[PDB]
């Protein structure tokens, strides 16, 4: 029956559950507001550079 199969699925609902949550929950410790900025093209890259210049010193992403 399914009661033998389901522990094989439940263990996959933990190990494959890690890479999704570990990448998301790390933004709380690393960044201030649980978000990482995407580069794409120099328009968004320049905004990242000037934010550190606008009184942040070491921090790349910071409010005000």
């Amino acid at each position: 029956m399914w009661f033998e199969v389901l522990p094989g699925i439940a263990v996959m609902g933990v190990c494959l559950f890690i890479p999704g949550m570990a990448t998301a929950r790390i933004h709380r410790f690393s960044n201030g507001g649980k978000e990482k900025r995407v580069a794409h093209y120099p328009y968004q890259w320049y905004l990242m550079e000037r934010d550190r210049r606008v009184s942040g010193v070491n921090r790349s992403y910071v409010s005000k």
Binding site: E35, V38, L47, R50, V54, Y61, S63, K64
Partner: protein, 110 residues
């Protein structure tokens, strides 16, 4: 080369952090005369050494825009700023519900 003076232009450049400026597209409508004249000068004459005088008025008018929002209706502006930075770079997606609180307070003013 003959470079510009050490004093340069604009005292205390930029308001604060990024994304805050990208959150408001009302900066296009209000204060456009100094922005367009700097744009018209720079495409005609490519040198930054000549049209820096118009650029001095751009940064000064930039402070005039942000001070008006800080004086009247600051509560919807701060809540909209927290919404845009919590997400990645959606800018307008999943933040339109909080955008309804904005503009409505600003509508009382001109």
């Amino acid at each position: 080369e003959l470079p510009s003076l050490e004093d340069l232009k604009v005292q205390e450049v930029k308001v604060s952090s990024s994304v805050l400026k990208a959150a408001a597209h009302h900066y296009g409508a209000q204060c456009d005369k100094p922005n367009k004249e700097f744009m018209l000068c720079r495409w005609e004459e490519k040198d930054p050494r000549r049209c820096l005088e118009e650029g001095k008025l751009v940064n000064q008018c930039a402070l005039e825009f942000f001070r008006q929002i800080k004086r009247h209706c600051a509560e919807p502006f701060t809540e909209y700023w927290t919404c845009i930075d919590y997400s990645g770079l959606q800018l307008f997606r999943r933040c339109r519900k909080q955008q309804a609180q904005f503009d409505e307070c600003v509508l009382d003013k001109x």
